[PDB]
Design a protein around this ligand. Structure first.
Ligand SMILES: CC(C)c1ccc(N2CCc3cc(O)ccc3[C@@]2(C)c2ccc(/C=C/C(=O)O)cc2)cc1
Ligand SMILES: CC(C)c1ccc(N2CCc3cc(O)ccc3[C@@]2(C)c2ccc(/C=C/C(=O)O)cc2)cc1
Lengths: 191, 177
């Protein structure tokens, strides 16, 4: 029950702040998580799901959101990873850091817009992860369809051709496989 | 190439259906036909031998798994590893079945499946130009079918997002091995 400019607006407003600071990295993660739970609650369609589902969707995607957020602010800082404005870093942390830097290098070369980013951040949450179950998942795919055509509109309003629009949508969703990859390869070392 | 010559090449490149230790053997047998399939994928041989090795090093279980989900699409609640074999592995099987369940609910067409297999290979690692060409192919077939741009976009996106689930399954499975 929302339009394109209405989805980005809801999302941009729900946007968490840029906080300040391995022990550091964890205290920053534990603090970014709380603004994420609120950001998740403010996602158009998320609060609707029951507590057992909302927790699943967040346990499944919290390290991807932390990674895409990180890759977003580090974009204008080539070779560096801006975890916080007071915590700029560089080159199993190192391999993760390289992939993280590669993703950023890419996002910058793609000229990813803040409005296009907040869409991917939501896709990462709704995508990664009885009757209640079969009906919640149906609505989740409904929301994900809304966001696809929100992104397509953003691209259309940005004067891209019909081909460019398709070719960029696939380019962004294909990055979201690598972020899952970095997410999972990171959870490995955490455990 | 062209969008109809693409799907033509892709379908003619398709590996055959072969017939724990049981599956372990089957997997290594299918890895030979997959390297074979990889060479026929338009634009793969153009790459350097180091790239070709690393793409297969990364995609090998994803390629097996997407092929498996395709084989078990018409066999609900079961996994068709081979026609002579229909069945933390309990967790992986559960996730794989859900992918067939999803590909069934979405009516995955063979022409779309061969397109996704090439995307899994070339994306899990000139590569972007070919990836755009396979994108175009998936989009052209949805247009050929007669679907609207709103639905095309929906089908393209909902399909590629299953690729992220395929990596999770790969990662989990590779962790265990
Ligand atoms: C390979 C391994 C060493 C590794 C693990 C994780 C990470 N990530 C990459 C993305 C990212 C993004 C941020 O904004 C902040 C922090 C991070 C860290 C640096 C991060 C995230 C969570 C936690 C702990 C949680 C807990 O136990 O409470 C610690 C560090 C990078 C490398
Ligand atoms: C959780 C974990 C134990 C696990 C790992 C992989 C798998 N996959 C799932 C998809 C799939 C699809 C097939 O067509 C064949 C086989 C398979 C197996 C069953 C498969 C793949 C590779 C190998 C080993 C090769 C080696 O190292 O020699 C063994 C089994 C399922 C579970």
């Amino acid at each position: 029950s929302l339009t394109a400019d209405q989805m980005v607006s809801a999302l941009l407003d729900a946007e968490p702040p840029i906080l300040y600071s391995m022990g550091l990295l964890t205290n920053l993660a534990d603090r970014e998580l709380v603004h994420m739970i609120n950001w998740a609650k403010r996602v158009p369609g998320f609060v609707d799901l029951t507590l057992h589902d909302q927790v699943h969707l967040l346990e499944s995607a919290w390290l991807e959101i932390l990674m895409i957020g990180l890759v977003w602010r580090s974009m204008e800082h080539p070779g560096k990873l801006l975890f916080a404005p007071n915590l700029l870093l560089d080159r199993g942390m190192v391999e993760i850091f390289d992939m993280l830097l590669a993703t950023s290098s890419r996002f910058r070369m793609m000229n990813l817009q803040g409005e296009e980013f907040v869409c991917l951040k939501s896709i990462i949450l709704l995508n990664s992860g009885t009757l209640k179950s079969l009906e919640e998942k149906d609505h989740i795919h409904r929301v994900l369809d809304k966001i696809t055509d929100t992104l397509i509109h953003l691209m259309a309003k940005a004067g891209l051709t019909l081909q460019q629009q398709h070719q960029r949508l696939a380019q962004l969703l294909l990055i979201l496989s690598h972020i899952r990859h970095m997410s999972n390869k990171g959870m490995e070392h955490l455990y």
